[PDB]
Design a protein around this ligand. Structure first.
Ligand SMILES: [Cl-]
Lengths: 247, 247
């Protein structure tokens, strides 16, 4: 009933889709995405038997890829797919919002221009923005033990919120940054040069920040903010946590 | 410099205070609090040598009890106090807001009448509302591995928000409930009879809910909502999580 193992015969299907500006992706695939002015494109490779258990379509301008609800299960639960291979390649004109859930990996590799890009991840997986991202606003939100890494950003605005034990890492330059941890996890942003940054920690987590002009440093709990640069810092600590300046 | 051990000679001091409607409490004490129309009262018992390292005062209508910032440490950190005995007893006319951080224990035992009471905890400690709490609204918020238990509530509104791995447990009757978990933790409310409840999980946590008329059940991740009662349920799962009805 609930668990379906891949039969070991991988099949690739190109799926006809309209453009989309939003992705709902649930699962364990390696998903490669790019923004592109070419025609919108979707290809999925998985054990041939698992397609019958998977939704893969664009609807209402949203690409939706996830395991189906269990047949006669009243949408109380979905199938637990165990593929031997699971790869997704897709593109659209713009990605304003990614909602990803699971143990998979979502990767953007080419230079990406953004107006507002929002990344929302739940689970143990990973999102990697490997290519240069440049533009107005990037938001990286996660709840879980996995991670998000943006390797090369140039932004007016960056916002990261981490719930639970995972990790967000950001590298580049930003004018204004907001870093938030609620849990034991960690934001790593020493090589993300911010002019102004706000750092908030609830509980035992950690933020490493580089702010050049203004740093607003807030901790409620045992957590820690490590900072570099020579900003003017506003400090606020309720609990056993601590703030420290590093070279 | 940072860790100060109790010298094993307990001293009790009654500290003169004005009335307060808010508490900031950081540390490991057993703190007993009640609402009362008598004169405001504070008594603290701790190893005699640790008073010098402790702030204990009412300012701006807020009772503040927390370890001091390390002398000449620029408020980057505070003393790590290791008492052999640490007890606090206090009362004020009303408690609108508690902010508690640490491994301590904050207990209210008498019948308590509330308008709006908000409890904010960070850390591994606990808050117990042992006596009957009756009134308009209770809000229980925590970030950390500890717990909040309310043993006997009767409320128009209840809101509980849990970040990280800890636990909130609520027993009684409420008209409208909102239960939120962002993390691996748990809300236990099978014994809190709600008319309408909204339940939200991000990542792998759990909620046990009892709703009689209306239940709005939302999971993003692998978490689980278990419900009892016969409400009309609205279901939304994005991920491997599930919803299940129990007797
Ligand atoms: Cl007074």
């Amino acid at each position: 009933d609930k668990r379906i193992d891949g039969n070991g015969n991988p099949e690739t299907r190109e799926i006809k889709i309209s453009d989309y500006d939003e992705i709902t992706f649930v699962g364990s695939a390696d998903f490669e995405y790019e923004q592109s002015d070419k025609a919108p494109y979707l290809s999925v490779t998985i054990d041939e038997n698992l397609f019958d258990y998977l939704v893969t379509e664009v609807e209402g301008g949203t690409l939706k890829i996830y395991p189906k609800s269990i047949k006669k299960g009243f949408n109380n639960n979905s199938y637990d797919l165990r593929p031997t291979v699971y790869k997704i390649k897709s593109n659209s004109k713009e990605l304003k919002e990614l909602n990803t859930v699971g143990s998979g990996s979502f990767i953007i590799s080419k230079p990406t221009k953004v107006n507002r890009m929002e990344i929302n991840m739940a689970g143990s997986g990973n999102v990697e923005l490997r290519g240069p991202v440049k533009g107005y606003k990037l938001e990286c939100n996660m709840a879980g033990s996995g991670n998000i890494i943006a390797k090369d950003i140039q932004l007016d605005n960056l916002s990261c919120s981490l719930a639970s034990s995972g990790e967000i890492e950001v590298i580049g330059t930003v004018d204004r940054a907001s870093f938030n941890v609620a849990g034991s996890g960690e934001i790593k942003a020493f090589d993300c040069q911010a002019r102004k940054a706000e750092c908030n920690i609830a509980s035992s987590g950690e933020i490493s920040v580089y702010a050049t002009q203004i740093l607003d440093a807030n901790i409620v709990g045992s957590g820690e903010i490590h900072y570099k640069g020579d900003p003017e810092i506003s400090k606020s600590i309720m609990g056993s946590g601590s703030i420290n300046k590093v070279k």
